[PDB]
Amino acid sequence: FALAQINADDEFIGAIDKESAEYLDEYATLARDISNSLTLVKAAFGPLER
């Protein structure tokens, strides 16, 4: 009954959404960090026993 109008004209430069593009790109940096961290722990700490 009280639907709010949503506009994103200022967010779009032509057909490109800058904020969404930069935010998605940060997952590539996280992916590199995850792989580097897992490999370092496996090298420093070998097979683990409890």
Partner: protein, 50 residues
């Protein structure tokens, strides 16, 4: 004798800039009516907003 030709102003074909320039569209005789190139902060070595 009288001097008829003693050189003069010499026209140059090209103007070569000595400074690195940011990407740009046409702005001289040809004017690009499209949107100027979008600058994206894509590749970040450290996480900022993720």
């Amino acid at each position: 004798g009288e001097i008829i030709y003693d050189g003069g102003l010499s026209s140059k074909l090209a103007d070569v800039v000595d400074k690195t320039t940011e990407p740009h569209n046409a702005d001289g005789a040809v004017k690009d009516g499209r949107i100027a190139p979008v600058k994206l902060d894509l590749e970040k070595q450290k996480l900022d907003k993720l």
